[PDB]
Paper text:
ClpAP, a two-ring AAA+ protease, degrades N-end-rule proteins bound by the ClpS adaptor. AAA+ proteases, such as ClpAP, consist of a hexameric AAA+ unfoldase (for example, ClpA6) and a self-compartmentalized peptidase (for example, ClpP14). Each ClpA subunit has two AAA+ modules, called D1 and D2, that associate in the hexamer to form two stacked rings. Here we present high-resolution cryo-EM structures of Escherichia coli ClpAPS complexes, showing how ClpA pore loops interact with the ClpS N-terminal extension (NTE), which is normally intrinsically disordered.
Following single-particle cryo-EM analyses, three-dimensional (3D) classification and reconstruction using RELION-3 yielded six density maps (3.22–3.38 Å), representing three general structural classes (I, II and III), with the latter classes being subdivided into IIa/IIb/IIc or IIIa/IIIb subclasses. In two classes, the NTE is bound by a spiral of pore-1 and pore-2 loops in a manner similar to substrate-polypeptide binding by many AAA+ unfoldases. For example, density for the ClpS NTE was present in both the ClpA D1 and D2 rings in classes I and II, but only in the D1 ring of class III. In classes I and II, residues 2–15 of the ClpS NTE were built into density in the D2 portion of the channel, but this NTE region was not visible in class III, presumably as a consequence of its conformational heterogeneity. The register of this ClpS peptide is very similar in each structure, with the C-terminal portion of the NTE (Pro24–Pro25–Ser26) near the top of the ClpA channel, and the N-terminal portion near the bottom of the channel in classes I and II. In classes II and III, the relative height of ClpA subunits was A (highest) > B > C > D > E > F (lowest), whereas in class-I, subunit B was higher than subunit A, resulting in a shallower spiral when aligned to the bottom of the IGL loop and the two flanking ClpP subunits. Previous ClpAP structures and subclasses IIa and IIb show four or five engaged GYVG loops.
Numbering used by the authors:
A (entry chain D): 435 to 748
B (entry chain H): 2 to 192
C (entry chain E): 435 to 650
D (entry chain N): 2 to 191
Write the structure that this text describes.
């Protein structure tokens, strides 16, 4: 259940267009897409590591920059299962027994291990460990053999194959240091403490077997404009199921972007304004009103009023 | 003995002193003679509050009998460099350096109590030294004296001649008289 | 084995009358009811998040001022169960294991989890995590995936996915600062201190996920 | 050395000094020579307690033996400005500034002990220097002295001329006699 050698023409087209497809879904963060796409190309090309995973990447960046979106979309593009393991649950050393299973003679031995069973069932998949920093430091030791030896033994002695798995860990450890305001007459330097935090949080051996540490930069104003367009497209798909149609003026999109643009909160506030500004008014009309059937919604903004002007012509 | 005070938070209650707890609300407390160590502490509180919340305004309570001029320059320079607008409120009396720091506060927020006092006197340069040394040292006080008059003049807005005429000898100004002279903008309005 | 009201989308009479029914039961919280009603209407109108919960709401205000009455009445009107959990009990580091469940090889593994079992048994329900501020930071971390992903893996490995439930969290962080006046001679503008205090108490990741912070 | 009292809090009991524990009970012990640091400390306590409860008054036990008027005046200015009145319970020696500060208390809430004694006298400062400097000091010192007599007379309500005559020379007023004079409303019930 792994990609076949001597890649076919159809698969080749996907690999060259993967970067373009991912960039369209996730704007900005080009370096992250380049590291994931290049690693996959080498593995399929036959230049991948003999006994290590396809790629071990640590995505450290501010909130809402798409650290997990680039991984979720990658699985959809490649049509492989997304093995998403939340590391918030594994906050203590005792939780290690859940991933690798309980030792013989103890309760839960029969249940097995979630990580070992998941990888065995889906050899070729994207392993996403969200909030890796929040997990206990001891849990990181388990990943050492996975990143270097490519195998994790289970309670029963079964060894998993991680050669085709894409290990991607998202963390916001350095966000606190960078956002904090320095004290003193002269503003202190920035972006240096973030790297120091990862070194403190993760042991040298952990950072020594990582294919790369991609830093996700803060979303720019231009990027946010694209983000608003992406959210509007999702709303258009939901409305299409009901037959409703939505058209938004270019001026309205720019206005909405400025209202919700937030550097600290990234792209998530854009969804909130979209929900309040667009979804809430339509909700009443969609249930009972003109939008019940036909739709043909047109939305614009009045410069003098500085408020949205919705239109419903079924 | 500094009295202890308690605050409340979801996690629990922390024990802090009276000055620190009041310093958490951006209220500084200047008290006693101006010493180099004292000035270092005052400026430190300003730099800490600047980072905490620049939008808010600090409240430097200037109740002191004055002291070395050099120490005050650090407080005066710090009061201006920081983004917040320092509000200077006199409580009981304002001395030579106290008055200069009082007027240095941001215009529109300076306040004083009804029974507050103020005083401005020429700096004292009495010392014994070598003839050559006296001239060099004496030249310095003239520059600082003129410099001090010019700085207060800009904040007060009165012409340099007015300051020179009044500063010829010790002068005391009551709270109502202070607003008339222009040291402060208005009296402390009821909360 | 449910009231059959939720399965029928065409029965929109309840949603239009939800505000009126809730408003008569609770007085002085019309703003909160309006926000709560509108959020459920969009969720039932097909504009709900594909993987996130129906709505994440942080009820911040004074204690006893109509915060839990809207939650119990809402469940009856929507014909869904009410899951009430007291966060005062879950204030220690190891209390988190009670909800998610203890891992294999430790005591309590047989217990699936207080929160995971309840959501699995009742996928459609109202989760009332009262006194959220008291909860340990570890519990807050678990909620991040709930809003972002919608599923909490249990000790047994079963995915406790709950995207239909409406999450309401009661806190009293903001009421404290607004009630207490400033210190010092000159009064200070504390209109925005309540929001800043909430920002400090709650990590930005948690706040960003929340749909809206209701105010009482 | 000071005592260690274990107050009762929901999370856990916390040790506190006798001053701090009683400060929770709106008590502000004023004592010793009037000083800028001492005066600054006393006003800080009152401001902190105003946040706790604006309606409830803030007790004030004054045992000051007198001192610099400017340092003491700081408490007087803040007392009038704060919304909660101060119950000036005079249980000991009350000098000019001490008694003056005691009189500052709001009517209907002041107190005094019969055993104690309350004296009011003009401030005396032996300034020395050039004749011109002495004249300047004489102006301001008389001006502030008049200000003290005018503000003090305002609260009691007695004619300013009477107060000036009594303060011309050092005199002592018995605590029960003070009630008749108007310095305090009445002695402690029991
Ligand atoms: N760079 C981006 N481009 C486009 N949309 C984005 C981007 N970043 C975030 N979004 C939008 O925000 C949604 C949620 O982003 P997340 O995946 O939660 O971000 P994140 O930074 O990985 O979050 P953490 O892991 O909680 S810090 C995505 O599904 C998109 O709708
Ligand atoms: N604003 C309100 N409107 C209507 N009923 C209320 C209101 N506040 C309290 N109640 C009543 O208070 C009763 C007792 O419930 P409680 O749980 O003690 O209070 P509550 O306000 O519902 O919730 P909390 O947890 O105390 S904030 C409820 O059954 C309500 O009828
Ligand atoms: Mg995430």
């Amino acid at each position: 259940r792994i990609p076949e050698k001597s890649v076919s023409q159809s698969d080749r087209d996907t690999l060259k267009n993967l970067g373009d497809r991912l960039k369209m879904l996730v704007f900005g963060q080009d370096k992250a897409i380049e590291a994931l796409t290049e690693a996959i190309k080498m593995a399929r090309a036959g230049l991948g590591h003999e006994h290590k995973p396809v790629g071990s990447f640590l995505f450290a960046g501010p909130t809402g920059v798409g650290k997990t979106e680039v991984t979720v979309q990658l699985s959809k593009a490649l049509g492989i299962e997304l093995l998403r393991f939340d590391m918030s649950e594994y906050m203590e050393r005792h939780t290690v027994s859940r991933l690798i299973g309980a030792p013989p003679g103890y309760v839960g031995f029969d249940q097995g291990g979630l990580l070992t069973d998941a990888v065995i069932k889906h050899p070729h998949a994207v392993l996403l460990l969200d909030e890796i920093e929040k997990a206990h430091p001891d849990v990181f030791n388990i990943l050492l053999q996975v990143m270097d030896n490519g195998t994790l033994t289970d309670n029963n002695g079964r060894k998993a194959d991680f050669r085709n798995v894409v290990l991607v860990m998202t963390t916001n450890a350095g966000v606190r240091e960078t956002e904090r305001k320095s004290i003193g007459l002269i503003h202190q330097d920035n972006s240096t403490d973030a790297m120091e935090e990862i070194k403190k949080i993760f042991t040298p051996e952990f950072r020594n077997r990582l294919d790369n540490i991609i830093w996700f930069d803060h979303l720019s104003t231009d990027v946010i404009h694209q983000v608003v367009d992406k959210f509007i497209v999702e709303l258009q798909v939901q409305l299409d199921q009901k037959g409703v149609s939505l058209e938004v003026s270019q001026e309205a999109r720019n206005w909405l972007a400025e209202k919700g643009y937030d550097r600290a909160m990234g792209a998530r506030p854009m969804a909130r304004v979209i929900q309040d500004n667009l979804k809430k008014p339509l909700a009443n009309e969609l249930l009972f009103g003109s939008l019940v059937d036909g739709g043909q919604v047109t939305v614009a903004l009045d410069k003098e009023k500085n408020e949205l002007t919705y239109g419903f012509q079924s | 003995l500094v009295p202890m005070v308690i605050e409340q938070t979801s996690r629990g209650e922390r024990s802090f002193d009276i000055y620190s707890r009041l310093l958490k609300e951006r209220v500084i407390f200047l008290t006693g003679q101006v010493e180099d160590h004292m000035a270092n502490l005052i400026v430190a509180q300003m730099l800490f509050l600047e980072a905490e919340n620049p939008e808010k305004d600090i409240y430097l309570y200037i109740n002191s009998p004055g002291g070395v001029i050099t120490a005050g320059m650090s407080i005066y320079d710090t009061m201006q460099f920081i983004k917040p607008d320092v509000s200077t409120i006199c409580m009981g009396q304002a001395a030579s350096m106290g008055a200069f720091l009082l007027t240095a506060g941001a215009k529109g927020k300076r306040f004083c109590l009804p029974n507050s006092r103020v005083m401005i006197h020429q700096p004292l340069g009495g010392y014994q030294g070598q003839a050559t040394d006296i001239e060099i040292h004496a030249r310095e006080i003239l520059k600082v004296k003129g410099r001090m008059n010019e700085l207060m003049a800009l904040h007060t807005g009165q012409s340099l001649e007015q300051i020179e005429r009044d500063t010829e000898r010790d002068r005391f100004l009551s709270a109502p008289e202070a607003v008339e002279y222009g040291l402060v903008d208005s009296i402390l309005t009821h909360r």
